[PDB]
């Protein structure tokens, strides 16, 4: 599983246009709680969720030192990777990092993660065993040799099993009312004529949290995946999410179609039809 914490780092070079930008954001499930941007007026770590604002100056100062050290480290790493790939000095490149812990319903660690990408492609990732690496190509094997010599994986296992779970459990308690309460979707089916012979049936899910959800259309109990337009789950802007699924149906056959909804906040799945 029911909870997780993730940090997302993005480092972007911009030759001829200044120093590389480093941004870090932190999430508990689908709630962002922290941000750091090296391009800010006076780069420092900022709160982004009410339940983190109570943390003292020691917390923000330690985070700022970690993110400032990372800013310099990713600038050097971008230069290293440009060389490993024999790339021109003219182009912009990006290193991304995503890491964190996943806790089951019992509050116990299910899985630890630490993944990196270069220009949108998997580069190096810590394996499930929390001790070995998967390096996607010859360049990433150079980073693998450095990280094995530095014993990076042992340090990451200690973080993921220890401080990551400790801090995730602390945030989950300080924000119990907004993080542990699953808001069930508000659902409804709308109908929109396409012509005199067809209509769109759109099944809506609004104001739900967490973002994970399944919306499907069936015709006489048969899945309509090929004929369904399913939009990506999108943020409403108030920490809740939205999603819809639509099917074009012959006019007069709407009763044969059902929308199926599965979400954490719904103990049993829903079956909805258009109700004129």
């Amino acid at each position: 599983g029911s909870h997780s914490m993730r940090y997302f780092y993005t480092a972007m070079s911009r030759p001829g246009r200044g120093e590389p930008r480093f941004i870090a954001v932190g999430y508990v499930d689908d709630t962002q709680f922290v941000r750091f941007d090296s391009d800010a007026a006076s780069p420092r770590t900022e709160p982004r969720a009410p339940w983190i604002e109570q943390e003292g100056p020691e917390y923000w100062d330690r985070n700022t030192q970690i993110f400032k050290t990372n800013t310099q480290t990713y600038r050097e790493s971008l230069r290293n990777l440009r060389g490993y790939y024999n790339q021109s000095e003219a182009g912009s490149h990006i290193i991304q990092r995503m890491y964190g812990c996943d806790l089951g319903p019992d509050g116990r660690l299910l899985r630890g993660h630490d993944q990196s990408a270069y220009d949108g492609k998997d580069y190096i990732a810590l394996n499930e065993d929390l001790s070995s690496w998967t390096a996607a190509d010859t360049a990433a094997q150079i980073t693998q040799r450095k990280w094995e010599a530095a014993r990076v994986a042992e340090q990451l296992r200690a973080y993921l099993e220890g401080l990551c779970v400790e801090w995730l459990r602390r945030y989950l308690e300080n924000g119990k009312e907004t993080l542990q309460r699953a808001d069930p979707p508000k659902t409804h089916v709308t109908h929109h004529p396409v012509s005199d012979h067809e209509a769109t049936l759109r099944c809506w899910a609004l104001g739900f949290y967490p973002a994970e959800i399944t919306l499907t259309w069936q015709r006489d109990g048969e899945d309509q995946t090929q004929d369904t337009e399913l939009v990506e789950t999108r943020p409403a802007g108030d920490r809740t999410f939205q999603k819809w699924a639509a099917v074009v149906v012959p006019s007069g056959e709407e009763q044969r179609y059902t929308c199926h909804v599965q979400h954490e906040g719904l103990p049993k799945p829903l079956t909805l039809r258009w109700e004129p």
């Binding site: 940090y7 970690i66 993110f67 480290t73 790493s77 580069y123 190096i124 990280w147 340090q155 401080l163």
Partner: peptide, 9 residues
């Protein structure tokens, strides 16, 4: 809270 495992690639 983020980790302090900071190494160049």
């Amino acid at each position: 809270n983020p980790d302090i495992v900071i190494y160049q690639y």
